[PDB]
């Protein structure tokens, strides 16, 4: 489904910060003693409003809030770091946690190339059957 | 690839300690009140330098250090216990997290015995076709 932003305004540009992955190729910057402080590991950037995706993203954070808050109510963990790991596990259990019924809507097996695999070897004995 | 140890020396023997799995078969030692203290749960052993694997292992710890240090830079967790669990998840997502294209290099399906499964039932109707 599409996300239709129903907010009063939308800031169409995304001025972001994140950390720099492989933050130290060669050199000594990876050694903690020599590297940057906590404050100096971030990179910045600018994203534009192509396909209105930024405005789309803003509404989505909004819709997550209720469900996220209810999740935090049910745990006794003081700091929760595992939400994405649990999502990944749920992906795996959804697809292969059970029986794969072939041609069913919940089994992701495509046999068209597998059909050509069995159909080229039909003629290895069926055509030379003199 | 092989590991070629490029260190000044190699101690070829591995004098180790670990914990003793199923540390209490029958008896009361599993009950915390009666069992050993923290200091008494370890077993020890001696490994020799067969296939130079010990010298191989020593260099490997060395090569891990940079990547490990960079990982610790990016997390806000105070104590990280989940590295192997995340490795296991990545193994699973690498193989079955996507579409399995049969005969492709990233799909681990072997059909040789499956070929004999379909080739013995070729003759159940093709040979008695009078």
């Amino acid at each position, epitope marked *: 489904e599409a996300i239709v932003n129903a907010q009063p305004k939308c800031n169409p540009n995304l001025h972001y910060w994140t950390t720099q992955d492989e933050g130290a190729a060669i050199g000594l*910057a990876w050694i903690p003693y020599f590297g940057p402080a906590a404050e100096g590991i971030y990179i910045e950037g600018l994203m534009h409003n192509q396909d209105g995706l930024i405005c789309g993203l803003r509404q989505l954070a909004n819709e997550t809030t209720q469900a996220l808050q209810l999740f935090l109510r049910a745990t006794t963990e003081l700091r929760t770091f595992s939400i994405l790991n649990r999502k990944a596990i749920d992906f795996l259990l959804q697809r292969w946690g059970g029986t794969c019924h072939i041609l069913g809507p919940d089994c992701c097996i495509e046999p068209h190339d597998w059909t050509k695999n069995i159909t080229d070897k039909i003629d290895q004995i069926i055509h030379d059957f003199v | 690839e092989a590991i*070629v140890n490029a260190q000044p020396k190699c101690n070829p023997n591995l004098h180790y300690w670990t914990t003793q799995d199923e540390g209490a078969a029958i008896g009361l030692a599993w009950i915390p009140y009666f069992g050993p203290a923290a200091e008494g749960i370890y077993i020890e052993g001696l490994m020799h330098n067969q296939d130079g694997l010990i010298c191989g292992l020593r260099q490997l710890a060395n090569e891990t250090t940079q990547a490990l240090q960079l990982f610790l830079r990016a997390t806000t967790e105070l104590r990280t216990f989940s590295i192997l669990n995340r490795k296991a998840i990545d193994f699973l997502l690498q193989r079955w997290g996507g579409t399995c294209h049969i005969l492709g290099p990233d799909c681990c399906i072997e059909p040789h015995d499956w070929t004999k499964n379909i080739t013995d039932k070729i003759d159940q109707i093709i040979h008695d076709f009078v």
Partner: antibody
Amino acid sequence: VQLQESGPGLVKPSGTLSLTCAVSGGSISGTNWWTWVRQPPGRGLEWIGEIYYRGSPNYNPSLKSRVTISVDQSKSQFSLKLTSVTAADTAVYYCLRLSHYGGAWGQGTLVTVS
Amino acid sequence: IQLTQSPSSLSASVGDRVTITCRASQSISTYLNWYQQKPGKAPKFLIFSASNLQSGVPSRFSGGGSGTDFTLTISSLQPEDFATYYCQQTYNTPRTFGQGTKVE
């Protein structure tokens, strides 16, 4: 750890440039990246490619269809091979060894075309 | 990624303080290999990780900088030091060199 280059002094066009970078005083294993640099005269230097001591070589995109690097640990040397050569790579060539603490340059070989 | 090295040519005398600039399009944060090269020869090192010397390099050179701006400074110049100078980033492949900076 010392490095030394070797190769011919002449190539012909539409041919193969072959370079042997021989290491002495150690071996190609470790936390050492092994890079190749070229410099046509009176200029700056131009990065070519590199290798690590396990596999999967790395490259430069303007050369990435016609350059191969290969390591031999027994004799402990490099073969760098350029194919489909032109008249725009006559240069003094170098093999650099780059590490986390330093590195070391070689002696450089003059290679022309004709 | 490409770097910009200023200025393209210099000339000075004995007793001054000379400064050569290497400036990156991005942020790389310590990764600068400064080198020195006389004509016909092969380049020696000067300074790796933008601040620390190598063993065999005199005690009057100095480096510095991070983020996107890196400098090299030579104090109390002698008539030995006429050589082209260079800088290389190591932050990701393909690594890239500057365009030289003549000293005389």
